[PDB]
Amino acid sequence: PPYTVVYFPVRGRCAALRMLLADQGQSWKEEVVTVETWQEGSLKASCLYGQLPKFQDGDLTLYQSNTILRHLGRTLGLYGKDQQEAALVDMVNDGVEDLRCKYISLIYTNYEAGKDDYVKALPGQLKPFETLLSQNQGGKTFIVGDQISFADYNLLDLLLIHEVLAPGCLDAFPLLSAYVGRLSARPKLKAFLASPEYVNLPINGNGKQ
Amino acid sequence: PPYTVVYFPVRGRCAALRMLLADQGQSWKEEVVTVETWQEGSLKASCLYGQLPKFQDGDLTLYQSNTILRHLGRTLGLYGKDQQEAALVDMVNDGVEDLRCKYISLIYTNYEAGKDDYVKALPGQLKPFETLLSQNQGGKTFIVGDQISFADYNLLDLLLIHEVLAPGCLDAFPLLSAYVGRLSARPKLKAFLASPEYVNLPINGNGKQ
Ligand SMILES: CCCCCCSC[C@H](NC(=O)CC[C@H](N)C(=O)O)C(=O)NCC(=O)O
Ligand SMILES: CCCCCCSC[C@H](NC(=O)CC[C@H](N)C(=O)O)C(=O)NCC(=O)O
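# LEE complex -> structure
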């Protein structure tokens, strides 16, 4: 601590981490990089991998958003309670990553044309999480075990951006809905999701949503 | 333990955990799934994300390559020695994933037309790892401190498939070429990189490399 997030002013790949932090009583600083600024060359060359986010936890400066989330699960204890659960929250976040990366392909490289087949192909892609909840206590808790993890935060968001893509896709998936409902009902998250801070910050930055 | 790897007759995405368990003196049963068995549908409906590798470590069946790699790191002590070392081995294995994702899209989507353009972007893609290496003992040891990590194996698999695709790439990356020269040497691994079950396997299946 203190936490400092540097990203472009989109919800993007840091919505999961922002939701984590605010739910887990933590504060953070936002340092915004606009596209004009990014274009002025320096910071992209400072960034290890040319991209964003950049997290600063104290003296540690992290990159790759999944790394950032794993790191806050080790540190804050959002990573299972044993090594089986740990393996499974890995299994599940890499599930959300694979889909998230496909979403990104639509939103930036084929939205208008591809959006079509995307919401058709979606049920088979959201299928595994529906399975996962039924095995984990019949979905009345969390995707891995019975304590929130950093994987509950990255799945809940992937779910939320898709309910915006398709107002209603989660209805085919009744346990997936029960989950989002329950998790947006956790107070610190609820207060966050309803904030100016969250609401007027675009999901993808290019207009598509 | 014991370890069972369930995959197609190709190195591909099990190459790195096979290098890991071989270098660390472990042994595993390879369960070989032919395209004929994948085609006859029963295995797919068992795998949680419809795909393979599938890995059994005793009572755990785990899906997804980097989750297995991350598991063996947690279990066989190969995820660095302290909190900073772990977020950095994850930050490196992530950086690696991003470039493996682009290599499999080159290989199973459009090799022929996409290659020249791929090999054009490669120096800019390998350059982060040279850097990481220079930051630590001038790249005299490993990619994250004193001792080997899962992220060291997986990165080594990427540069070996990349030297088959673009022979001459690593020659400008001397630390990175020496890194391969020194981790290939460690004779438990070196015995494996000349075994039948490694030399007699296709990199990619599709016939491209
Ligand atoms: C203005 C709106 C842009 C919307 C996308 C913002 S994120 C774009 C990109 N970053 C990434 O790709 C982040 C991915 C990285 N692997 C991670 O997991 O953290 C990135 O920083 N790209 C900039 C670049 O490569 O030049
Ligand atoms: C049958 C074609 C010849 C074999 C080529 C190698 S197949 C490897 C491929 N696996 C993946 O894409 C799994 C990816 C998963 N994210 C992981 O962490 O590893 C995969 O399983 N896909 C095959 C499929 O979906 O049928």
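# post-check
Chain A touches chain B at residues 48-49, 60, 62-64, 66-67, 70-71, 74-75, 83-84, 86-87, 90-91, 94-95, 98, 101, 124, 128, 131-132 (CB under 8 Å).
The pocket of LEE (ligand 1) is lined by residues A 8, 10, 12-13, 35, 44, 50-53, 64-66, 205; B 98 (CB under 6 Å).
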